[PDB]
């Protein structure tokens, strides 16, 4: 049993930034891989990026040069630096974690992020 914990959304103007954590509990040792999706109000969720354990890091085209993901082991930590905000980014930020050499998944809650004025 894995369970992931998020934190640091929030409303903030076009050119901001913001860093997202996903904090892992449990059995966080059969961790595969963690990922970022987020929900844009009206669509499918969509992927973000993506780490391993070794901090092997891809991402998609729609956050490629702005968004960073990271991980901190110490802390079972994950996170989404949220570089160079556009107000199309304005969606619910939800992270997952693929645990058991990839046989389960596990989600955060989700954090809203809200790109105006
Ligand atoms: C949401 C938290 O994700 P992370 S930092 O994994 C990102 C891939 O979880 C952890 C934490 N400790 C670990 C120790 C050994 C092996 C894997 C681990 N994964």
């Known amino acids: 049993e894995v369970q992931l914990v998020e934190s640091g959304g929030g409303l903030v103007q076009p050119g901001g930034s913001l860093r997202l954590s996903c904090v892992g509990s449990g059995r966080v040792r059969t961790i595969n891989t963690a990922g970022w999706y987020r929900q844009a109000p009206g669509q499918e969720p969509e992927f973000l990026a993506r780490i391993t354990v070794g901090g092997t890091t891809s991402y998609a085209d729609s956050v490629k040069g702005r968004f960073t993901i990271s991980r901190d082991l110490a802390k079972s930590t994950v996170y989404l630096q949220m570089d160079y905000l556009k107000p199309e980014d304005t969606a619910v930020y939800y992270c997952?974690?693929?645990?058991?050499?990839?046989?389960?998944?596990?989600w955060g809650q989700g954090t809203q992020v809200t790109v105006s004025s």
């Open positions: 997952n974690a693929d645990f058991d050499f990839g046989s389960r998944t596990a």
